[PDB]
Amino acid sequence: LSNKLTLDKLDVKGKRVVMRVDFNVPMKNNQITNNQRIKAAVPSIKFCLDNGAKSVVLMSHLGRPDGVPMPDKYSLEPVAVELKSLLGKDVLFLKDCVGPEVEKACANPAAGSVILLENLRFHVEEEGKGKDASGNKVKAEPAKIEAFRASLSKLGDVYVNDAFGTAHRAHSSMVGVNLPQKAGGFLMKKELNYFAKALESPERPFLAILGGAKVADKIQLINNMLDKVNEMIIGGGMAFTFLKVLNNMEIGTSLFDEEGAKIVKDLMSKAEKNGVKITLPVDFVTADKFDENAKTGQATVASGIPAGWMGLDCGPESSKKYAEAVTRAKQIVWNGPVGVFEWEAFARGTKALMDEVVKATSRGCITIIGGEDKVSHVSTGGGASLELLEGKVLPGVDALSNI
Ligand SMILES: Nc1ncnc2c1ncn2[C@@H]1O[C@H](COP(=O)(O)OP(=O)(O)O)[C@@H](O)[C@H]1O
Secondary structure, eight states: OOSBOBGGGOOOTTOEEEEEOOOOOOEETTEESOOHHHHHHHHHHHHHHHTTOSEEEEEOOOSOOOSSOOTTTSOSHHHHHHHHHHHTSOOEEESOSSSHHHHHHHHSOOTTEEEEEOOGGGSHHHHTEEOOTTOOOEEOOHHHHHHHHHHHHTTOSEEEEOOGGGTTSOOHHHHOOOOSOEEEOHHHHHHHHHHHHHHHSOOSSEEEEEOSSOSGGGHHHHHHHTTTOSEEEEOGGGHHHHHHHHHOOOOTTSOOOHHHHTTHHHHHHHHHHHTOEEEOOSEEEEESSSSTTOOEEEEETTTOOOTTOEEEEEOHHHHHHHHHHHHHOSEEEEESOSSOTTSGGGOHHHHHHHHHHHHHHHTTOEEEEOOOOSSSEEOSOHHHHHHHHTTOOOHHHHTSOBO
């Protein structure tokens, strides 16, 4: 991921720039509740403008239209308005993102123009599949996917992807823009830079913190990271499958993966061959049901979790052992929380861990959190950086130009 063209190396003087951005801002009744994403794209836009771009055409998606036009539910129009204010420059909103009219509008704009197109996911051709009003799944048509892609391509002379968080999908706006230079925007640059260091030449010790719910769909994540790390914390719902299998721990109604259980000793067996020191939790915050407002308890591996109750967070002794690993690390990658941090009662392990990760950063650790000024890098894509850590090829990253 080191050798990708980035916007700062791209010539844009007098060029029309088609820029895929992340403008999926949280919305309430069509009013933007957090403009943080729009803000994050401004440096890229401005760089283009300050460097004499003829136009920047912004294409993005919002919400969940699933390939049906929903102008009154998932329009990008409000975003154009916020952007005009963020930039101090007019932004031209277009009511579609492809077709003859949009093409004429973009063919030779007034120099310095900024254009936001309507939501890409109004077209089944963006994602290559969608639904209808009755919610019956539909397929896109090959011929029409290709035409969509040719129309997006008509809108600029160079292309910028600053949408890392979509870069794991082979979508028209990710892989379909056929233009001679395809660069990463400034957000995408930071992602490639941080993840490339971590995967290629991490500082050492390299600690991976892996949490979340399910073991089953994290087998490649763990496997690949076992090729690379020196230490790994296993937390979140995952840990109960490991502790049941490895230690015969009573887990109560804690998440258990019957399929995952059968490979636990396989993974530990790989950790051992490789010299990766595994830190599992040793105590827990328990809950009488899966609910924000459940009664809370405490349990250790020795006592086990009681009948009826589940571990939704690690305890104080687990936080210390976690901290011991964090204290050793010179490079940390963290993917997935270590308890149900959405619920205040089950959020202490995660907050405490984050406090340790923040101090580590102060002392000079390189710290990467998956999908904020106190860590080295917060990733802008959750699914994408997970597939990265799995060692997969990301279509939108792979499509960018080399050198
Ligand atoms: N001990 C636990 N038991 C059940 N769920 C948990 C536990 N710890 C964390 N989780 C939940 O798992 C979710 C993250 O799981 P993950 O596999 O990363 O799914 P996602 O696909 O949402 O990222 C979080 O929302 C968190 O609340």
